[PDB]
């Protein structure tokens, strides 16, 4: 139940199994390397036999080469499984995030989603594989050390297997106690840090009201309290390991005393006691690691639960089913009002605008509200809170999203150029339904083939980031070319600020009459030239419409039309 | 950095010396613990059978008690030094931050200054002190271990002091080689991660054009590349430790093979070789710890350099020296252009404005473009780029900043409340000057008797870490009381209340009557009732004044009155 991850890692069980075998060999390498001490001392520097010290360097090098090569094999295989489960997790996560509605993508998570794909998904497999290493390698180290101690000295091994659970619980209970103490001290330290934050935050009022003398005198007390809290934190942290080592040394002294008093014991040779004591020092580390393996694993699976919440989150609802291809019917807004998801202030009041068929009715004015969100409403980026958007005699909630978004083409300057070729970028998604002849025809009709064909290889060069890096005016032309692959009877034109693209601005306008040759066009205009050729103008400020005139007819209540 | 840091830590050299000698004793303790093996293997299981195995465990417990006590003493004393140097660093840094211009706080550095107060100031003492811990301790371990070898086996100790330079340079060079190998792979991983980010930042375009299939395919490609880069990165990272251990094992095997010669043997007892190889295995850690010493001290000095760059930055320009006590003169904005720091668009365009003394000149901006900056210019938060503010017949560059800020008083509902008494938050840096009777009179004139009675102790209640949680109206009434008590000749009413409450609203109205009846007030307004009561209303849009008259006078072109 706590995993919900085994199906994803199931196809790669071979890597886990071979990594476990490699780690078993890794632990056995150190176990045999410590077992070497008995021939090193008994057969070596005890009874004089130098022949055992001739091959002892060679067997040390052999076991160390085994240890290095099996450590690398374990790392490679466990990281291969981690890499492939990360690849599958990121693949599913990205496939689900692309389908998620943009309201989730808008300001709920914008830069941390890369961390979800990159950092948290890495952390899941990193912590899980670290836990598996720490429970296999170190567990087998404990088992091998106890086997060796049983084999060489079953008496001291019995004493050690009596106290090893005892010293394990002694480590675990004091670690938990001091970690809880450190958590309480951390909470207090965070409170004082937030007090310092509040001291820093009112910088403007310190300058006017009085000066820095009182603030410095109070920060002296706050920083002294921070210093005392830090000293107590590090004191509680540094009193932990000494106690653990002291209890481990109590166990060490008990084991050494088990060789002292019983005359039936102390039949060990020098090598046997050396091995059974080096086994204790080599067992201290696995005992310390096995106690903390569950915390690491639970951290990993907590990150994995965080990554699963996004994975199985609500996706973009596709309840509408009306399929539409080349709608000649026009869009109409009837008292539709939209509030931004995240806020409560309606940025768009009841809109009764009906944009006609084939016309170029624009929207004028920086409303700081749902002026731009009408574009989002046409393409169903943000679902309309109340009202109906009726295009071609049917509400947008009835249409299939895939068919509907094919009807609408969005032209802007903030255009995400996909990391592909120019031909694929201006024929994205439907890269096979348009052939390179259509690409050339649309580029020539876009008044944009001159610089595209100038661009290195032409239509087959790479347009992506860290590439040719076309400009914003050139991005307008590329988006217009993508729209001039047609199959988009609804045009929505952002127009940006129209920062003097000049012959490319004339390209935008010539291509705009080419688009509006048959397209129902809604322009969120910031250029008066588009207003001049606009057949109708509706001006919205602060989410409320003020006029529905037409340029010179609109000058009855001028306001800011001159500017 | 350390050259200029050392005076700061100089008064606390006693703690450094005590921690250093404690670490010397800790190193000596663990080396004596290793040295105890020679009695254990010679006078114990060796030639002399018994009469040492009660001495040995008792001395082991004593040495481990010494090890724990010395470790805790070193941790506490080095933490005391770290605390008393970080407290001085934080105090100096905060005293310089309070003196820096508001432009430094306003988006040149966000609330992460707290981190530079807390985190990057800690890391220095965390990196330096830890480096010292790893300098004095591990070196004293090294100086211990070789001596422990020299006392027991000079023959093997010569081989080991030949090799330990060789092993040290081998460890250092392979570590440098593999870190240099790893950082290039890290750069490539960052590049493909940025490519994945650019894939993520196209969600609107992908949804419009239905390229989720193409996006999933290209993300499969980039995620496979990411997985391969991760596998190569962890391979390069995990091929380092095996090579280090193999080189150390070559050194160990060479030592052990040299022990096989008759010249080295015939003097190494069972305990002598045991202590020699125990010293060998214990000598692994200090060398890597010295490499980590160099790395840690470099990182700490980098952080300290960052903090010093923050410390020695340019401060508030206090070149003016003219002192003003009661500024009864009219204020004048005369041909003034202000540009926001970090931006090129002038928030305030070149415009002229008179602020007659004793009059409530109202400044009206719906958008806020250049509205609130007029309040900031008088208080010299942001220095005026062009033009002079002729206050009382002199430029503010001539006036001393302290007196100028004493004359003016900013009033808003966004006023932050200091974590002091209400009697001290109502008089900041003036509670020692204005007596409690004046505090009572200010509370009486502030019409905050109900809210000051909501406080428990009343006049002397503590509004600390949001202890009382005064609301926007309550906070505005406290700031109003502060303005009354300080008796600022110039008032700047933010009027950010924006028609909230009634008793607080009438309190604001009556209190601004008490204030502005004998006090010039540059009011930026949201409530239109204040605008009607205002004498000279100045409508400001896009940094330029459009209409400078009365409500009925400039009703010819209302602009924003009907809103
Ligand atoms: C030219 C010269 C150069 C040539 C050199 C030749 C060497 C060739 C070998 C190649 C390298 C192999 C390294 C190795 O050792 O091989 C290890 C296995 C050895 C096989 C190698 C070949 C041997 C056979 C060949 C011989 C010929 C045939 C395994 C390993 O590989 O594991 C290595 C590991 N070794 C051991 O554990 C077994 C130990 C033991 C070794 C066994 C063999 C002993 C010698 C054998 C021959 C000698 C006899 C003749 O070995 C040691 O340490 C050295 C001690 C030597 C003497 C001890 C006893 C002597 C004999 C005993 C009686 C006979 C060692 O870490 C242990 C250190 O941690 C504590 O410190 P703290 O103080 O707690 O902070 C210790 N405190 C302690 O233990 C406590 C006390 O000491 C003693 C406890 C009380 C004793 C009671 C027993 C315990 C009871 C348990 C049951 C009851 C320190 O004190 C030291 O012990 C040494 C220090 O001087 C003190 C010495 C005094 C010791 C006691 C004296 C008393 C003696 C008897 C008294 C009469 C000690 O130094 O180092 C590497 C780095 O591991 C770490 C790291 O430490 O960073 C750990 C993890 O990190 C973390 C963590 O996550 O937990 C996070 C870190 O951020 C950090 O916080 C860190 C903290 O340190 C932990 O708190 O922990 C991990 O992650 C890992 C990571 O992968 C990064 O690499 O890194 C690990 O490698 P890695 O994991 O693979 O990467």
From Swiss-Prot, chains A, B:
This is ATP-dependent lipid A-core flippase. It is a multi-pass membrane protein. Disruption phenotype: Absence of MsbA alone causes accumulation of hexa-acylated lipid A species and glycerophospholipids in the inner membrane. Changing residue 77 to S: Does not affect ATPase activity. ATP binds at residues 365-372. Residues 16-299 form the ABC transmembrane type-1 domain. It is an enzyme of class 7 (translocase). Changing residue 197 to C: Exhibits ATPase activity. Forms intermolecular cross-links. It is found in: Cell inner membrane. In addition to ATP hydrolysis, may utilize another major energy currency in the cell by coupling substrate transport to a transmembrane electrochemical proton gradient. In vitro, MsbA-mediated ethidium efflux is dependent on both the electrochemical proton gradient and ATP hydrolysis. Identified as a drug target. Inhibited by a series of quinoline compounds that kill E.coli through inhibition of ATPase and transport activity of MsbA. Pfam families: ABC_membrane, ABC_tran.
């Amino acid at each position: 139940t706590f995993r919900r991850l085994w199906p994803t890692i199931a196809p790669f069980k071979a890597g886990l199994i071979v990594a476990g075998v490699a780690l078993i060999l890794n632990a056995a390498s150190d176990t045999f390397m410590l077992s070497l001490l008995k021939p090193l001392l008994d057969d070596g520097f005890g009874k004089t036999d130098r022949s055992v010290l001739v091959w002892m360097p060679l067997v040390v090098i052999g076991l160390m080469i085994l240890r290095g090569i099996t450590s690398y094999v374990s790392s490679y295989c466990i990281s291969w499984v981690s890499g492939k489960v990360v690849m599958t997790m990121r693949r599913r996560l990205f496939g689900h995030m692309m389908g998620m509605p943009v309201s989730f993508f808008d300001k709920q998570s914008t830069g941390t989603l890369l961390s979800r794909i990159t950092y948290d998904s890495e952390q899941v497999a990193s912590s899980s594989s670290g836990a598996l290493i720490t429970v296999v390698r170190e567990g087998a180290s404990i088992i091998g050390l106890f086997i060796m101690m049983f084999y060489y000295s079953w008496q001291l091994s019995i004493i050690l297997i009596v106290l090893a659970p005892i010293v394990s619980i002694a480590i675990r209970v004091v670690s938990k106690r001091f970690r809880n103490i450190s958590k309480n001290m951390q909470n207090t330290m965070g409170q004082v840090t937030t007090s310092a934050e509040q001291m820093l935050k009112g910088h403007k009022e310190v300058l006017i009201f009085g000066g820095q003398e009182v603030e410095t005198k109070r920060f002296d007390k706050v920083s002294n309290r921070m210093r005392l809290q830090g000293m107590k934190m590090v004191s509680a942290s540094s009193i932990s390991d000494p106690i653990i080592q002291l209890i481990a040394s109590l166990a060490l002294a008990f084991v050494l005393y088990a060789a002292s008093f019983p005359s039936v014991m102390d039949s060990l040779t020098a090598g046997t006691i050396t091995v059974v004591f080096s086994s204790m020092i080599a067992l201290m580390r696995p005992l310390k690691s096995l106690t903390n393996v569950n915390a690491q694993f639970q951290r990993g699976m907590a990150a994995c639960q965080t990554l699963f919440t996004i994975l199985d989150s609500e996706q973009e609802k596709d309840e509408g089913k009306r399929v539409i291809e080349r709608a000649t019917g026009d869009v109409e807004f009837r008292n539709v009002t939209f509030t931004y998801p995240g806020r409560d202030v309606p940025a768009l009041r009841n809109i009764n605008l009906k944009i006609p068929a084939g016309k170029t009715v624009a929207l004028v004015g920086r409303s700081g509200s749902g002026k731009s969100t009408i574009a989002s409403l046409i393409t169903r980026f943000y679902d309309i809170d109340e009202g109906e958007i009726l295009m071609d005699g049917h509400d947008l909630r009835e249409y299939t999203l895939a068919s509907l978004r094919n009807q609408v083409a969005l032209v802007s300057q903030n255009v995400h150029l996909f990391n592909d070729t120019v031909a694929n970028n201006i024929a994205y998604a439907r890269t096979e339904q348009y052939s390179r002849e259509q690409i050339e025809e649309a580029a020539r009709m876009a008044y944009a083939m001159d610089f595209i064909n100038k661009m290195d290889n032409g239509l087959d060069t790479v347009i992506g980031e860290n590439g040719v890096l076309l400009s914003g005016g050139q991005r307008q032309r590329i988006a217009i070319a993508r729209a001039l692959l047609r199959d988009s009877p609804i045009l929505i034109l952002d127009e940006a600020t129209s920062a003097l693209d000049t012959e490319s601005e004339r390209a935008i306008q010539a291509a705009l009459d080419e688009l509006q040759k048959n397209r129902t066009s809604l322009v969120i205009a910031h250029r008066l030239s588009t207003i001049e050729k606009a057949d109708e103008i509706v001006v919205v400020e602060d989410g409320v419409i003020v006029e529905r005139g037409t340029h010179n007819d609109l000058l009855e209540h001028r306001g800011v039309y001159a500017q």
